[PDB]
Amino acid sequence: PNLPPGFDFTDPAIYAERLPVAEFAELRSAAPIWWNGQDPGKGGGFHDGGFWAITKLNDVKEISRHSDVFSSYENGVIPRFKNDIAREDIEVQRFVMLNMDAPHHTRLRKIISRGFTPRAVGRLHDELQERAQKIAAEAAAAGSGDFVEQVSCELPLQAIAGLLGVPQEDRGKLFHWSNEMTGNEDPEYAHIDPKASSAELIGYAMKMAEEKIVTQLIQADGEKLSDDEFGFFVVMLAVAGNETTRNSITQGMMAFAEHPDQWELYKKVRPETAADEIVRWATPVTAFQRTALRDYELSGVQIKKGQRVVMFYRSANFDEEVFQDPFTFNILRNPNPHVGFGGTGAHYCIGANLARMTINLIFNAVADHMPDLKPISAPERLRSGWLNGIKHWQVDYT
């Protein structure tokens, strides 16, 4: 592949500036499964010398289906942390369902599914609709400002808060904790600890369960979450459903600003197909990883026991062999077999429909209250080597 020497698809330095679209496309053409070597002290907390970069949609899907071979437990699924992270701080992330394997995963996913039935998510619809409309109304009123803060941030948080029945009086502190919890190495957030906020939120979660969806989860059925499991559940959601859906909203609106015909069409018909195009295009989670528990031949590459594989959803979502005109934003996209919510398999995003609803509700409200919104200045990107984040985006709502 024509890539610079020692180029690392997980390098936070890249994502601080841009998405490496041209580099991904190069791999898809020249080396769709490619060993991304990492020098010592530069593996983002991993010290195994590198990982297999997975760039093709079907390979991402194959990995995600074969979780009997490709493990989330062994090194967790987050492929990049601060280079100096202690291993202990990686391993502790095995206490969330995301970073478990069968049979422990199966049991927790089965219980936590109580929270995510279409009926449970459907019940949140009206309050989130009301919240979305008021958010949009308040941003329109303010004239201009930070679209991330004023429009993208709060609804995903309210969706988490509503699913859990957090009292309104407690939502402020909950959101504060949640917003310090998804680790990054960005200089704007250098003074934030993850650790303290996580401890403090698990403390609240376990007090909440003590005082008591929360009911369904901690009530015996005789499967129930233990109080610490409920805590681990809440801490997981604070990361899983926060900056993920936020960046779908930010970058979907960015897509609309760049594709004014799509925005015009959206405002008329709010089509059913928009949310999934927004997710495909935003690809909030750039990459998650797995560790091979045995040797596995994947598209002619001999993957070895113990090696990491990094599924770059940002590549797979633009796979030219699958998506017609992948680099066209098409809100009527059909079909749309994207992996923005993961490959289908044991770990496929449990919050996918909760995210779609959040997305439709906010964009309906934006179309309603700020139909002529225009950016004032460039998005500011988050320094993360797995999260595709926009910290700030100054826009003129009128």
Ligand X SMILES: Clc1ccc(CO[C@H](Cc2c[nH]cn2)c2ccc(Cl)cc2Cl)cc1
Considering CB distances under 5 to 8 angstroms, the limit depending on partner class, which of ligand X, ligand HEM, none binds residue 389? none
CA separation (Å) from 381 to 236, 306, 315, 317?
A: 23, 33, 18, 20
**Burial of 70 by CB count in 10 Å (0-12 exposed, 13-18 middle, 19+ buried)?**
buried
Tokens found for residue 274: 């928009």
Cβ pair 235, 138 in contact under 8 A: no
Residue with tokens 């681990």: 232
**Beta carbon nearer to ligand HEM, 73 or 140:** 73
DSSP secondary structure letter of residue 173: H
Which candidate, 339, 278, 313, places its Cα nearest to that of 55?
Answer: 313
Considering CB distances under 5 to 8 angstroms, the limit depending on partner class, which of ligand X, ligand HEM, none binds residue 181? ligand X
Q: Which stretch binds ligand X (CB under 6 A): 132-140, 166-174, 190-198, 359-367?
A: 190-198
Considering CB distances under 5 to 8 angstroms, the limit depending on partner class, which of ligand HEM, ligand X, none binds residue 87? none
Taking CB under 6 A as the rule, does residue 279 contact ligand HEM? yes
Taking CB under 6 A as the rule, does residue 355 contact ligand HEM? yes
Residue with tokens 């941003």: 139
Dist CA 261 CA 256 (whole Å) = 8
Dist CA 392 CA 359 (whole Å) = 18
Window 169-208: contact mask with ligand HEM (x via CB under 6 A): ----------------------------------------
Q: Is 52 helix (H, G, I), strand (E, B) or coil?
A: strand
Q: Which stretch binds ligand X (CB under 6 A): 184-192, 206-214, 236-244, 282-290?
A: 236-244
Cβ pair 16, 56 in contact under 8 A: no
Window 154-183: contact mask with ligand X (x via CB under 6 A): ---------------------------x--
Tell me the closest approach of the beta carbon of residue 396 to ligand HEM, in angstroms.
26
Q: Which residues bind ligand HEM (CB under 6 A)?
A: 64, 72, 77, 97-98, 109, 160, 236-237, 240-241, 244-245, 248, 279, 284-285, 288, 340-342, 347, 349-351, 354-355
Residues annotated within the binding site for heme are 349
